Amino acid sequence: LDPLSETKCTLKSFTVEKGIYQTSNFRVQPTESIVRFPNITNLCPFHEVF
Amino acid sequence: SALTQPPSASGSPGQSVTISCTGASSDVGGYNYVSWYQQHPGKAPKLMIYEVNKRPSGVPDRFSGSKSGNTASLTISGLQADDEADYYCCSYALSRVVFGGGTMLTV
């Protein structure tokens, strides 16, 4: 909800003293799309063995 | 794939003739998956030349076979009057038998 509730959950308490008193979290940027690039070839001759 | 055979063949009795068979496939087992069949007009075919490095029993040594690359060859030493028949080659490499167009061998 807000940084106050986040640091409350981090400290596992409803009362937080003056100051940071802990490290809130770590920022990690996520992905937004996908980039696939396989090779371009012909069908594999699997009938030659099976 | 599909096999290719000449439309017809000609040869005088006593000499030798060669029948070509191009289009034979292969697999991981070998390259000798070529067989020949002779069918006289008015009866069922008969297995004459298969596994060209060998030959079945009861067949004279006049019928010989070979294969160079993707082309098969059928060698007949002596020609007789009872040799006028359609000769088909068969490729049975990829678990699938395919008969060629056939050739007309006349003496």
Side-chain angles (χ1 to χ4, degrees), chain A residues 4-28:
Chain A
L4 183 59
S5 301
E6 180 180 353
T7 187
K8 284 179 181 179
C9 298
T10 302
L11 295 178
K12 297 296 178 299
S13 61
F14 291 82
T15 59
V16 181
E17 299 181 359
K18 178 179 56 180
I20 16 86
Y21 215 173
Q22 238 292 338
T23 300
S24 180
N25 202 329
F26 295 88
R27 180 189 70 262
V28 174

Side-chain angles (χ1 to χ4, degrees), chain A residues 47-50, chain B residues 26-28 94:
Chain A
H47 52 69
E48 300 180 0
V49 49
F50 292 98
Chain B
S26 60
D27 55 350
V28 300
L94 299 178

Side-chain angles (χ1 to χ4, degrees), chain B residues 20-88:
Chain B
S20 61
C21 180
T22 305
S25 59
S26 60
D27 55 350
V28 300
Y31 302 89
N32 302 330
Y33 297 93
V34 180
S35 60
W36 295 86
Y37 299 90
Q38 179 178 359
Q39 178 182 4
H40 300 267
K43 62 178 60 180
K46 181 179 58 180
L47 175 62
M48 295 259 73
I49 293 299
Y50 91 101
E51 199 68 27
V52 294
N53 53 27
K54 302 178 180 61
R55 57 177 178 268
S57 178
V59 181
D61 53 355
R62 295 166 58 257
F63 300 92
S64 300
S66 60
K67 182 179 181 180
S68 60
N70 50 15
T71 301
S73 300
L74 180 62
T75 301
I76 302 179
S77 63
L79 299 179
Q80 299 180 180
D82 63 330
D83 299 331
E84 297 182 357
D86 300 70
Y87 294 88
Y88 306 90

